[PDB]
Amino acid sequence: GWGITGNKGRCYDFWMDFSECMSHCREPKDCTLLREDYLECLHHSKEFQRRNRIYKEEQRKLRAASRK
Amino acid sequence: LAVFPEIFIINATFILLIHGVVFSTSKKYDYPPLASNVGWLGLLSVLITLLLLAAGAPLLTIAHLFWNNLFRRDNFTYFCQIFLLLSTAGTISMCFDFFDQERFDAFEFIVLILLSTCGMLFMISAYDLIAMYLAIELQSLCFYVIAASKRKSEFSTEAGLKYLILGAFSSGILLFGCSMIYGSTGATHFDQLAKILTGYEITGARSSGIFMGILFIAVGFLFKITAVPFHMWAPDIYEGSPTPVTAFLSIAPKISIFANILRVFIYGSYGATLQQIFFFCSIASMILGALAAMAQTKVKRLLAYSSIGHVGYICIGFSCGTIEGIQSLLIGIFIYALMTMDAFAIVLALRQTRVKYIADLGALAKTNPILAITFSITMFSYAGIPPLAGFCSKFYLFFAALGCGAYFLALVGVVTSVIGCFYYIRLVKRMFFDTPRTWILYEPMDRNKSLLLAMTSFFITLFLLYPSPLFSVTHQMALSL
Amino acid sequence: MVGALLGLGTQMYSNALRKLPYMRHPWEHVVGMGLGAVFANQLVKWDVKLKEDLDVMLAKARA
Amino acid sequence: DLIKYFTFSMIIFILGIWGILLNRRNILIMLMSIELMLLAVNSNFLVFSVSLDDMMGQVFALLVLTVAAAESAIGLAIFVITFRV
Amino acid sequence: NTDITALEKAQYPVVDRNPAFTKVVGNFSTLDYLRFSTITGISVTVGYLSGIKPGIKGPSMVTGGLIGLMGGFMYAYQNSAGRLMGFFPNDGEVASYQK
């Protein structure tokens, strides 16, 4: 898991957790908590979906104030 | 260590390549026709590779560095890799005669075949998307050159251009899929990919990025094996090129792709999408082939369509998830390969005849009567007539399919076998009963081509008496994945 | 063995395409094929031993 | 912003496959679109390697560079041979 | 880093895990030297015999011998290594119990 500037990459740490937890893991479903955390580091989708709602609720108040 | 069997063929190719160029560019040797001297030496290079790979089969997995970051060699790969070299050598054995008749000074053409085998050996053991794509690229690139070998005749070169574009697109489509698969996985290794994709189930668990890649990777593979969804100009490639080059692409790339297909999809991907697409392709390929066998007239094209129909029967084994079905696919690949080599060799037996129709191929009852019976055996093997080895493989494919529950897919295969059998009895009728078409008299071939027929035709008939060894070998490979 | 009988048949009807008549000095190579049958049967005992292991290895890996 | 640098590459790839489908008549545009889609997957690997902060993307992008270049070499050489003398 | 640790390893008693070259080649049994010798022959004989047609009998024999040397030597090395390491029959443990 090397990176653009190396430094161990960024999500190798999450992959390390997903892989350590994928040793004799009962099922991927059981360890999916680390895989989703690993995917979240890779694409930042979880932050984005929250950012969209934080933007939307703030936008919804601003849009409601603007429409009056 | 652990790459020595692949290293030898690459070294053997380099040593033959240097030998051919230095010798061919020799005033002292009068610029001699190296091909056929590169041959025999090329056939033993494959045979030495076959021994080295077999000898080190326990030693193949020498170190983690090779398996984890480059290529992983396993018991399934070893059994198929042995078959891949034997298939390649068998094709070279019939091809030697073609080299003799042709003014073949193309020493490089043999080096391309050995380089293709090295790419194919790396393809079977490739355990990373990068490795699989790079290995596929080398095996196809060597194949693209062999298609365009007869430069003076545009028919081979134009056929090469369609093969080249189809090859470039198939490699390119597979590459785009790797990019999308890489984006979600964060790693290119099949082993790391399997951990992320284990039980992904695009319906059960959301996986938009992985599926986007999987769609492209699967589509690219189909173009390579001439699957009917992407058959495109691939049947055209078979008839346009001369019979011997056509034979080489007919079996060895296809076997390498099918073995690569089982490893890349069954182990790495677990969604309910991969099995169904093969199930649709299998029905279509057999339907296209059965319609084509009646529709197509040229003997060379008919063989390609019969091979495409057989490819659909092979696809059913992957389509049914059962390991017994994957084993049945392997029984089919071996029988199809032996028959495909045998079929090309019988056409190669009538080397004297220039491009000619089936009716011209008829009248072999009076002259070469034993060859006429041999031609009947080859058509029967794809037909599915019960005594021949092909039916026993098809019955295992069908018995597995019924156990897998693929009644609709199994029925069309029986129906397509029925559609094929009628044309085959008509072709058998054409050989002896009717349509002699001028009592044409044929010519002899090399002993190797006769032995390719002898060792195969006897075995095809002998399969009934002792069919246990092949069934045992096939299941072991499927279980290993 | 049965394989030697097989390598006599395969050597004959071969070159029949060449219409070469009957058999010649290289044709009597059924000792070599006899060896192939012995190895094929031997491979199957090893393959069957491994085939049982493949089922058991799958079960050991399954746990 | 990764979507902007990917969906743009995705539709460059779509342009490549589109030109493949349309231009089955002319082959030089076929090869143009081949190298186009082998860029839109190459630039895709580079973008996805900067995003994921992973170096496998750039290793694979370099190898695709020096493989698509050999592919273009053999492609154009086959195209020149196709226009025989 | 690298490590010779193997999958399906040590099925027979190991003699020297990760044998150094110049030792695994100094372990050539009179069968290995007989495998490295028959491969080089079948590769010189084919190499000379293939070259009867183009007039290159000598140099094609030499290049067939080069191929045979490389291949048969890597095969003898495979054998003596899977023997020194625990991979092959490995009846040459007397060489360790004696020395």
Added chain:
Amino acid sequence: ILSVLSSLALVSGLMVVRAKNPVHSVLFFILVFCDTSGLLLLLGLDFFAMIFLVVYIGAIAVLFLFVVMMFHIQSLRYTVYAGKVRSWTNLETLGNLLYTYYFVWFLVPSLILLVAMIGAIVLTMHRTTKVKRQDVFRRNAIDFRRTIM
């Protein structure tokens, strides 16, 4: 504003697939590569920008230009000051991998470049050397020499 100027690459890619004049096709090809290298610069992948330049618009679209000219068709960041003490230039952090860890995926592109050399030779030698410049070839004893015309 140069960020969104990838629209230039986007439209030039639409040109190459919708152009009958091949000079415009290759020109907008070169343009697509120049804008893709601009993009790869904005991402900081400096090595890949120059490699795109070199091995695309100094070799490959050179090839394509040849095929046209001849053979006409008609705030909140938290910069972690660790890992910045030794900034690895992109070449160094590609070489730390490609030649030691993933070196077989680098010796296989070696074989692909070798196959490209062998291919460009066997294809486009064009009977201009020992491929056919060996000789016309003639044999006197078989030759009729006026016995048979």
Added chain:
Amino acid sequence: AEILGIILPLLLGVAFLVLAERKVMAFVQRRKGPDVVGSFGLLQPLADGLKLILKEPISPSSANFFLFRMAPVATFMLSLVAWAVVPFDYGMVLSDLNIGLLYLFAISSLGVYGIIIAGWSSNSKYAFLGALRSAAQMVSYEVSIGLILITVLICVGSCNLSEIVMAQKQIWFGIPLFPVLVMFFISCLAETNRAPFDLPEAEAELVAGYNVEYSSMGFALFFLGEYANMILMSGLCTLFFLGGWLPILDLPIFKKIPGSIWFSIKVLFFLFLYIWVRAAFPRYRYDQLMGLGWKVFLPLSLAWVVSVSGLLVTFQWL
């Protein structure tokens, strides 16, 4: 910006290099070169210029103005933009690129376009094939310059040109790799055309070998381009191999050690070597020339990458 302070002095450098070549190559032939126009011909470049500017066109032909009226602009812009990364003294490079060298390689790979386009827009089969031959030569001695730079790069840490000239504080790479300097010079001679290697530049075949519509501006811009490309490719034999701006380091009392003056002295040596070696040697015929870039300067360049990599790997000198 300050790009004027690197293009205008370079324009004057090229204009005075035409005179420096005529004058040095004349002194070689036992004759004073341009000597009446200026005090010592110093105004002769301005005379050549102001003449070419005041020469009426042979045909206006301003219609075809996007095809080959911007192709000399492209060649010249490339020859001038490869000067950014060239450092004249410590911290005098206009833009210190951490991949500077590869950027020079790319600029050459685009100069190939410059030549090919400016030759194709000349609708003269002989002149177009001449431009294609010149491009194939400029690009065949680019694999050799590439490998020579890989040698001088193995010796250095990074591609940063300021580092390649800072990596020579101990010894210039001209002293250990002298055989390489001879190969870089004999390649920079051949990459550019101005050399024993200029059959496409055989006195007549050059003028009728770049364009059909001259109008004078095209003639001057090609020669201004060839002379800037020459100042550049001589400003590379002095960064890589000679110490870019480094003295001999004896630290004299008479010499206050200016940097850019040392870079200037060395690039003058290599320009004088360009001239001297144009005077004293016959042309190579472009059929032995291409057989010298492949069969002579590629094997002897590959060997050098393996020699300077080996001898630096065994003894940990890297």
Added chain:
Amino acid sequence: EDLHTVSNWSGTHEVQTRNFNQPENLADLEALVKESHEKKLRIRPVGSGLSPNGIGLSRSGMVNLALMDKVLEVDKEKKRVTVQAGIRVQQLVDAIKDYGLTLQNFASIREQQIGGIIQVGAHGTGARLPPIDEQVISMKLVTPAKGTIELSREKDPELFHLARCGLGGLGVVAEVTLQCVARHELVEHTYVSNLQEIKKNHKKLLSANKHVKYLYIPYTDTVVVVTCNPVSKWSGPPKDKPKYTTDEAVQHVRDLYRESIVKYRVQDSGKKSPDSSEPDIQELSFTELRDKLLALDPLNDVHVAKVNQAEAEFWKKSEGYRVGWSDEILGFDCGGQQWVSESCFPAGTLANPSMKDLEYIEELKKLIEKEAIPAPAPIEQRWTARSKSPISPAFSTSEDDIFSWVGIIMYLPTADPRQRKDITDEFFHYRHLTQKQLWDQFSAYEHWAKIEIPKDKEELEALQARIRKRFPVDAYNKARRELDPNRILSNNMVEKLFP
């Protein structure tokens, strides 16, 4: 029993949980044992390491027990569970409960394998309750080279006792058969009482239930005490046609080892009374308090003493008692491992007149109070019966006796880790709670799971000779050499104990 799924359609996806290292086939494991017996390499079964004594050595070859854990056989007619030693005690008790039978005594921690617990002085709370070591009817020991020989308590009582007391050094138990008692219901009690009051009430608790467990926390007069009472069959309402509703008072479903993960839901539902014993937590506020108790040692933590009283009051606010099946209700040690080392006084029948049960409890509790260095984690005190010959048929005859087990627990992970480990080991060795300075005359039996005479570096003589002087393990030492000549099944702490 089956595995937890295989996506590959094959074994290539592996599930094993504990013992991730991977265990070979039983024949293959025996072949590895034969290979060591012929390589002379020490081999031990994979060890969790929760026990301070190192039954499994990382240096020694480790054998995966996942297949042994997966395969379990229980016979209802014989009331015997025949299972490999690899299976954990919690899985084994659950299987016995599924068959309608219960185990009379239980191990301290569910995670440890039952076979390993039998090796480490297996015992359970109860003066009248027989120890697990006497509750095992049969055992199978690996034969040094290839194969195993089946044995039973009746067939080889002395050999079975020697192997069980050997900690697995004498032999490794391939398969162990445990007698299963008729199902009975245990009601768990969690409450906090004064140490002086609880020592005075120890006789009353022993009379009331016959099983006594005391946890001692330093700097607090009140020490948490947990007790289990076996209810009579069909107590209160008699059994009737409804299986659960009528018998709900007599037997009710209860959570067993519910807090597998330390993090717990902070939401309040149902009774919603927060406790640190039966549930990890029932309220958000008591979860923050528990985190503070973990962070600060009790001596510096005022809240922990208040929390202990509050949790006892919360239990009174919540259901007065919780009734569950004996297998269902038991005391489980926390997953986190904290080093425990101490010796256990034996309440022998001859010694009972000389020292009273109240006197034994008072002296041990006073000694724990007198300890110069306090141990932050609670100290568990429990009583087990002798290995009576009637409980499991044996040729050897054993006089009825009782034992008192005391273990001193200190926090293994701490700031500047292992500095405390050194001082506590010195405290165990020479302070008021001393294994050899004052307890050598007492001949108190150290628990096998605990480390013996710590630090082992400070004294190795006691393990080799003083333990042989304290108890007749001299026959076991000769048996250890006799049972394994190669000594492939060798543990370094067992080597000190038995040469």
